[PDB]
Design a protein around this ligand. Structure first.
Ligand SMILES: Nc1ncnc2c1ncn2[C@@H]1O[C@H](COP(=O)(O)OP(=O)(O)OP(=O)(O)O)[C@@H](O)[C@H]1O
Length: 315
């Protein structure tokens, strides 16, 4: 009965969140405008809702534009505004960038990535140094201080039954779905679901494509043919990763579980063996040419309307 014990904090947190949102709604707090288009990707949950996949998909749609991701870079022990990546060129290590913005830069070698708590300041720096044509906020639904021309909200079925922090995982009450210009329905593979709001709505799917090597280049799945791999990941990821490796038919001779906080500073792989791990782990192991991650293609069902919305923000 522990969870219900946190409900009083949830109701309190609701008042705090609703007040802030009301101030934004009614024009009491400033909303700043960058002089090029801004697309926000977001979610209502503190848990994952497929954002990295959707940013990959979104960047691919925008492959003919100069793209810059504006990330919070929340973890990082350093602060201020920081260029992590210039169109694929990493400017800092993962330690300094934080895991997540560094990983996004590796997953998207054609886009820039800027880490900045204040997204607007991030954009200004990018404008001066990188001359991008469009910004993507990878987690910007609540960052209402920055105007976005297209507000995309990711929603998984589980969100619809959740409750506010700290009793549940929601950062905001479900009514705030109203702020979205478009919904992307995620986690379809494990929990398929429909949701009608009248808003433009798109189901997202992932499909296995290839391995990623330690340099994050795409390499064929073929190399696993008649090989048994050693797989490893952080403590929590162990579950999802295992299930996925099995359903893909990947032969695993041994699995290893490390703590979620591992910098792999003591990791010693065996020459001649092939390793599979998560992209979040892979970033700490570049150079090891026998360590790979799985790469998935990202697709949106009936995407045409989404493309139209994106097209129209460049006027
Ligand atoms: N299309 C993809 N190909 C390869 N790796 C991916 C892809 N999309 C995401 N990843 C990596 O795999 C992890 C799991 O993906 P998934 O979307 O199931 O989890 P999530 O926690 O909802 O995602 P996120 O970390 O973006 O919030 C992500 O955290 C990211 O590191």
């Amino acid at each position: 009965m522990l969870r219900s014990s946190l409900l009083p904090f949830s109701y309190l947190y609701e008042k705090i969140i609703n007040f802030r949102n009301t101030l934004y709604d009614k024009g009491f707090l400033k909303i700043k405008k960058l002089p090029v288009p801004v697309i926000s990707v977001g979610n209502l949950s503190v848990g994952g809702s497929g954002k990295t996949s959707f940013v990959m998909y979104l960047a691919d749609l925008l492959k003919d534009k100069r793209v810059c991701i504006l990330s919070r870079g929340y973890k990082r022990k350093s602060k201020g505004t920081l260029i992590v990546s210039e169109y694929g060129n990493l400017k800092v290590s993962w330690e300094e960038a934080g895991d997540e913005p560094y990983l996004m830069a590796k997953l998207l070698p054609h886009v820039s990535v800027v880490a900045s708590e204040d997204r607007y300041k991030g954009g200004l720096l990018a404008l001066e140094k990188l001359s991008p044509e469009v910004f993507i906020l990878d987690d910007g639904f609540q960052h209402r201080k920055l105007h976005r021309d297209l507000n995309i909200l990711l929603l998984k079925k589980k969100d619809l039954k959740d409750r506010l922090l700290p009793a549940g995982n929601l950062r905001e009450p479900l009514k705030e779905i109203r702020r979205a210009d478009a919904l992307v329905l995620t986690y379809q593979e494990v929990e398929p679901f429909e949701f009608f709001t009248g808003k433009p709505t798109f189901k997202m799917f992932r499909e296995f494509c290839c391995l990623l090597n330690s340099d994050f280049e795409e390499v064929p799945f073929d190399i696993l043919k008649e090989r048994e791999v050693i797989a490893f990941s952080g403590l929590g990821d162990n579950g999802q990763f295992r299930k996925v490796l099995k359903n893909l038919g990947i032969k695993v001779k041994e699995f290893m579980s490390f703590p979620d906080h591992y910098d792999y500073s003591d990791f010693t792989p065996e020459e001649g063996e092939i390793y599979l791990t998560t992209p979040k782990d892979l970033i700490k192991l570049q150079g090891y040419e026998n360590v790979f991650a799985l790469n998935f293609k990202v697709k949106l069902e009936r995407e045409e309307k989404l493309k139209k919305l994106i097209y129209r923000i460049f006027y």
